């Protein structure tokens, strides 16, 4: 039978991604794949493989000006007329890490396992992170030539 990962089989590592000029979608896809563990040959869709991901410089991500001016973020509180909208520009002014985190979470499978997968994600706006005790190796986006 094909290999099925057991408890204790999976191993985790720490990655730090600098988002100083990466496009938001590119960075989100890379982080989502790293979190899920699709880069490992031991991957199984029912097992939370994958590694911890730290994103720094979340305020420096690359977004177009028209997107900053026109892309909406919606929320409904549940009350009548409870729809609240903010632009990506205001969101980046206030909580830049939330824009990145929302983009990443939109790209994970919509099931229970993603709730446990996303616990390994840390997004910081500045160039510093508190997890120096762990040793996050830097990760850069690469494209395998075809």
């Amino acid at each position: 039978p094909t290999y099925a990962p057991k408890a204790g089989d999976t191993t985790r590592s720490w990655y730090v991604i600098d988002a100083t000029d990466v496009v938001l979608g590119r960075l989100a896809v890379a982080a989502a794949n790293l979190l899920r563990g699709k880069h490992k040959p031991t991957f199984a869709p029912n097992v939370d493989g994958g590694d911890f991901v730290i994103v720094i410089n979340a305020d420096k991500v690359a977004i177009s000006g028209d997107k900053l001016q026109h892309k909406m973020v919606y929320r409904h509180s549940g009350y009548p007329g409870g729809l609240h909208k903010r632009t990506i520009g205001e969101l980046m002014q206030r909580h830049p890490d939330r824009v990145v985190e929302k983009a990443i979470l939109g790209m994970l499978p919509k099931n229970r396992l993603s709730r446990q997968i996303q616990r390994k994600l840390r997004v910081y706006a500045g160039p510093e992170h508190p997890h120096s005790a762990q040793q996050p190796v830097p990760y850069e986006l690469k494209q395998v030539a075809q």
């Binding site: 094909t2 290999y3 699709k38 880069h39 490992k40 040959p41 395998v144 075809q146």
Partner: protein
């Protein structure tokens, strides 16, 4: 695909190169090999890469 991209090649070209080299190893056994003998998988990658044509876009 995970193992191929680990060895820096796409699934596309790995399959095409294995077909060109005439290796008829199954996908099931290819995945088993990828998990169990990474050195053997690497050797298969070099074989497929060699069998690939000089320019894949012509």
């Amino acid at each position: 695909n995970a193992a191929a991209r680990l060895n820096d090649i796409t699934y596309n070209r790995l399959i095409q190169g294995l077909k060109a080299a005439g290796v008829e190893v199954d996908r099931k056994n290819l995945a088993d090999i990828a998990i169990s003998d990474p050195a053997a998988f690497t050797a298969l990658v070099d074989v497929a890469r060699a069998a690939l044509p000089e320019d894949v876009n012509a």
